[PDB]
Design a protein around this motif. Structure first.
Motif: not given
Ligand code: HEM
Ligand code: HEM
Ligand SMILES: *Cc1c(COP(=O)(O)O)cnc(C)c1O
Ligand SMILES: *Cc1c(COP(=O)(O)O)cnc(C)c1O
Lengths: 490, 491
Positions: A298-299, A345, B133, B137-138, B140-142, B144
């Motif tokens: 993902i990151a 996640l 939220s 979560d998405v 933060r996982a990315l 950002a």
């Protein structure tokens, strides 16, 4: 009436058999029309994306590719086997309109089946282990499927198993069928006919290695058979979780743990559709590898995918080390992040389950520091019962931009000059009106002795964070944290 | 600080040749066999037919859906995020390693965080605290950084997401706000790509298009090119109750200020919104939206967000005038992923009062009955510290299939005969080993005065449901038992 999911395969296929000797009905991939008749036509033709970063981070000389299957209609690789199994059943005359479909599943097959049943008008009962995520349940229930749970760690033999219970329900319900993804030829055939043709066509026939995690085994079996036929030079590498029995040799399987957090892969029995003879080598993966690597997908690569995908790549970076430049390695990415929203996640879940040690260092200098280092100033208080314009008077007269609203001592919220003024200029509030109309109700509380990283977390949810007695000593926002970090920067 | 509501300086008017355009336009290109990176997976979204919901509401015409939740990030925002970046990069305004700060509903934020992940930009996202939220979560996982702003904070006030975005921009070196509200790249994305897809897929024949309105880029961008290449098509905008975007102003007069549906509506008119190309406006509410989104899911098998639900909810109204042979295309912006714990959740729908418990009516006859009506029998209890083969002996001796493992009297779990035997036969346990090896730890408790339907809910989470008093167990129930009862009562 109960059929064993581990019953040995009666399939007479072996490498070198003509496509003519096959008894099975094969479906060729077809062009998608301009307008789709229903969502089920959105299953297949999944993109082959290059892994740009992660491959080189681990020093892979080869080309690392990912077959992203989470772009299917239901959002998993299971959407393929669910349509196919249904379609074939309809051709057998076994599946009749208005009939009931019952399936034991990890839940991806369940979602694909509930989706297809929703479209085509079948009643759908899904039996899944209690371990599986609630997100799956929300999606199933939303699709209109009836849901039954079975205890994880319950032997596949026992009457309490998901497969067993699936059968016990089938016996008690009229016009109810179990498509049986574990024994159904449609499962590996879906991949043999479609997924493998896609992988080949996309890679122009040139493929050095394939890495795939293993559930029922339809994906790896179906792909590997056709790959061994049309690209025999390709090495087939299976991935099995620690705690499963699927890997060969048996020595790799000897383990302490029984149950694990990763969903969808591994079993306590050998499925009928699974052909272990076409897997050249096996690898064991664990929960930590999976979640770390998935989060990494993902990151780094921007691929929103599930944990099994993480296992698959986590093994791929190892198994593909032998390979050298000009060679390519394809990876199977089964499902999306959607199923795992509140599990891997979520940082709190990762901590609570001990996958993320708080030690695992990467954070900046300011991460560990007290909020007291910020230089705040205690703001003026006020009642919720005050009137808007009056508050304007107090604010300008004291030269303050904002006040926390405190009760006759419960902190009710925050009111700022700018929003007050803005609200009046729009005619949204009167000067005689109650302050509670424009008040900011949502905030979080901190101690002067709390860490800056805690604040960094809090500000991802709330705008205001008030430092308070163990009485408000200050109001802190992200902007204040920035002013501090950046002031201390030069 | 630059105003997001500043009126457009664009000199475009219907009838202008594409040659007169000052803008760099980008034509859709053929996707290669292997994608260099995931950002090439944005666009070419499928056009799916609405088979059920349209006919249920009596549309004579063809109802089509442009599904935008199939984009890499999973929203229609993935388009404007790539475009906005690329143009900036072509401008030389966006340099490697630079910081991108954006105010957003969170879908633009996700597309931008995703693009930043691939191309290597630092990404700071500013979103209202109202937003779900799942988005956090998405994001933060990315990778950002996340800043929140109070909902109901006026777009002028410094506490607004736009204002805070600007204040962040001012304090950070090499930081740029791509500004989806003022950026021409946003509607241009839709003009160049989305509209072209809609046209090609419909073969140029399109009677009506319905789209919900955020910044306004989707509807503006689509409508301009649609008015150019398909003038017969009617542009229908959707605005939530409490927003000011709809015309005329009479439609906007309302009690409420804030609403639950995410992504659409604003307290200001964004620059990118061209209200002149919107033929008609419709007001929508939260109930309509969630009802219809859930309807898209259950009926059409489209897993999509609330805005999609609003869009269709309006579509079934606005498309009534249309008749057979005519088609209406609907824009479905994003997926269920962001809303997993909100509108998709029954408890949230109840808690916010969108699902009235009245609408119990659709449920079967046995639904309201007491659980005690099942005819249970208090089972034999054993100690957690008892030994395997012993439990086997007692179980066979009394003809019980299972015993609840309960001294304090708190039930620790459940043990079954079949699983024990199976466990022994496989050699995972010894007859002298303790029950804790094979014990099922997870179970739920219910009252005799609870409804059978409540039990039906309980059985969607757990396999075992124990009927107990306030900790005396009077019976153990699974789904199979509920089935046996109903089916017995059926003959
Ligand atoms: C070369 C062509 C093939 C031939 C001649 C062949 C032959 C057969 C036959 C006759 C059966 C029925 C066994 C019985 O009931 O006695 C069978 C079973 C089966 N085959 Fe194939 N097969 C071929 C290819 C494949 C392929 C490529 C796959 C996977 C993609 C596949 C998947 C299965 C499965 C899952 C069963 C389950 C049978 C059972 O219940 O034991 N078959 N095969
Ligand atoms: C012949 C066609 C067009 C012409 C001649 C034209 C011309 C212009 C010009 C001269 C500007 C001034 C730029 C500035 O002030 O910074 C502008 C702005 C803009 N245009 Fe266009 N344009 C055309 C078509 C379009 C289309 C089709 C779209 C959207 C799909 C679009 C979206 C915008 C936007 C969002 C702005 C920003 C204006 C502002 O800063 O307020 N334009 N246009
Ligand atoms: C089913 C599944 C797999 C395993 O695929 P098989 O074809 O069963 O080997 C992997 N990951 C997820 C999330 C799955 O649902
Ligand atoms: C942004 C967005 C919209 C609105 O699209 P615009 O082009 O801004 O009109 C609708 N729904 C969702 C979920 C969005 O993120």
């Amino acid at each position: 009436l109960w059929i064993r999911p581990d019953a040995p395969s009666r399939c007479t296929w072996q490498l070198g058999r003509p496509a003519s000797e096959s008894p099975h009905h094969h479906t060729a991939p077809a062009k998608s029309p301009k307008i789709l008749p229903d969502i089920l036509k959105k299953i297949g033709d999944t993109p082959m994306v290059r892994i740009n970063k992660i491959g080189k981070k681990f020093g892979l000389k080869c080309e690392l590719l990912a077959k992203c299957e989470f772009f299917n209609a239901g959002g998993s690789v299971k959407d393929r086997i669910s349509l196919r199994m249904i379609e074939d059943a309809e051709r057998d005359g076994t599946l009749k309109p208005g009939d009931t479909i019952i399936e034991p599943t990890s839940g991806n097959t369940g979602i694909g089946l509930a989706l297809a049943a929703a479209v085509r008008g079948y009643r759908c009962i899904i039996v899944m282990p209690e371990k599986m995520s609630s997100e799956k349940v929300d999606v199933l229930r939303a699709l209109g499927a009836e849901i039954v749970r079975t205890p994880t760690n319950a032997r596949f033999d026992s009457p309490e198993s998901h497969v067993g219970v699936a059968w016990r329900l089938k016996n008690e319900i009229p016009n109810s069928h179990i498509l049986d993804q574990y024994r159904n030829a449609s499962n590996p055939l879906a991949h043999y006919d479609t997924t493998a043709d896609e992988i080949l066509q996309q890679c122009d026939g040139k493929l050095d290695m394939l890495v795939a995690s293993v559930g029922t085994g339809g994906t790896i079996t179906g792909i590997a058979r056709k790959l061994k036929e049309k690209c025999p030079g390709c090495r087939i590498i299976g991935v099995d979780p620690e705690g499963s029995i699927l890997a060969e040799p048996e020595e790799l399987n000897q383990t302490e743990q029984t149950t694990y957090e990763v969903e969808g892969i591994g079993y306590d029995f050998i499925p009928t559709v699974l052909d272990r003879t076409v897997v050249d080598k096996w690898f064991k993966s664990n929960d930590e590898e999976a979640f770390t690597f998935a989060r990494m997908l993902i990151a780094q690569e921007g691929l929103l995918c599930g944990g099994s995908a993480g296992s698959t790549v986590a093994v791929a970076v190892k198994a593909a080390q032998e390979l050298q430049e000009g060679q390519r390695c394809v990876v199977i990415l089964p499902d999306s992040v959607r199923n795992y929203m509140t599990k891997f996640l979520s940082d709190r879940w990762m901590l609570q389950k001990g996958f993320l040690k708080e030690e695992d260092e990467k954070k900046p200098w300011w991460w560990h520091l007290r909020v007291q280092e910020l230089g705040l100033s205690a703001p003026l208080t006020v009642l919720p019962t005050i009137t808007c314009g009056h508050t304007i008077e107090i604010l300008r007269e004291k030269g303050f931009n904002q006040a926390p609203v405190v009760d006759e001592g419960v902190i009710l919220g925050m009111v700022t000059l700018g929003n007050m003024l803005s609200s009046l200029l729009a005619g949204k509030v009167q000067p005689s009106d109650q302050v509670g109309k424009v008040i900011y109700k949502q905030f979080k509380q901190i101690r002067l002795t709390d860490t800056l990283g805690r604040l960094s977390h809090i500000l991802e949810m709330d705008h205001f964070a008030l430092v308070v007695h163990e009485m408000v000593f200050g109001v802190v926002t992200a902007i204040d944290l920035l002013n501090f970090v950046a002031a201390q920067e030069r």
